[PDB]
Design a protein around this nucleic acid. Structure first.
Length: 238
DNA sequence: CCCCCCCC
């Protein structure tokens, strides 16, 4: 029986949520001073709230191919505990981890559950944010560059890299780096309003941003401050 | 249990 995400608490292992996926990761392996394994993570949203959920190893195999982004599912039992704020933009005290107990059945998208949500920081306000801290931002993609292939000696990877320059009603332009696939797909033609959840702050250049693979980019967010942006921009931004 | 996200 279905409770909101707002209600979920480590003190009660009996719960079902009807949540829609807003972010699914790809499967990633790790190995360290502690452990070995693979995982993928999700970000969920309902009418009450949002939550990050992560499946490991044997659930990654169960569940990776049964969950896709933008769809609505019942999630039933997982592991809850304090969110590591360091590593998310997601707005919850806790954080779910699948287990052998987890069930994931498809739920009806008839209650229209919402889409990504954001807690924005003005591009003029990033001066007051810390390096490595995660931000949410909305901006006109004033301009963008072609993608290039960076070469990472530290770990031996050749990554796609695409810089984009984002401006908001303050006239402050911030450089933002896309990586990998993102760097490759992105087309900012007609200068769209982008809303990016969980972009990571960087100090290169004073303040810039790095769009991580955990970040969630919405091309023309159907949200009030996007019309507010295009409005200004087609006037003062010109 | 991850939590790396790269470069100038």
């Amino acid at each position: 029986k279905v409770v909101p995400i707002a209600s979920l608490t480590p003190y009660q292992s009996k719960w079902t949520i009807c949540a829609r996926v807003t972010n699914k990761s790809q499967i990633r392996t790790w190995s360290n001073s502690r452990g070995e394994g693979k995982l993928f993570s999700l970000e969920l949203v309902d009418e009450s709230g949002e939550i990050r959920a992560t499946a490991f190893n044997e659930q990654v195999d169960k569940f990776f191919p049964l969950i896709e982004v933008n769809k609505v599912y019942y999630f039933s039992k997982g592991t809850l505990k304090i969110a590591n704020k360091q590593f998310t933009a997601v707005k919850n005290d806790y954080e779910m981890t699948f287990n052998n107990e987890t069930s994931v059945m498809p739920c009806e998208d008839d209650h229209h559950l919402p889409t990504v949500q954001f807690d924005f920081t003005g591009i003029d306000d990033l001066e007051n944010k810390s390096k490595d801290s995660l931000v949410d931002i909305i901006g006109i993609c004033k301009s963008y560059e072609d993608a290039t292939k960076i070469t990472v000696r530290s770990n031996n990877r050749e990554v796609a890299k695409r810089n984009i320059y984002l401006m908001d009603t303050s006239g402050k332009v911030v450089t933002a780096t896309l990586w990998g696939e993102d760097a490759d797909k992105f087309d900012g033609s007609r200068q769209p309003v982008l809303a990016i959840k969980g972009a990571r702050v960087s100090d290169f250049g004073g303040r810039s941003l790095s769009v991580l693979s955990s970040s969630t980019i919405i091309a023309n967010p159907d949200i009030p401050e996007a019309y507010k942006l295009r409005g200004w921009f087609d006037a003062e931004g010109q």
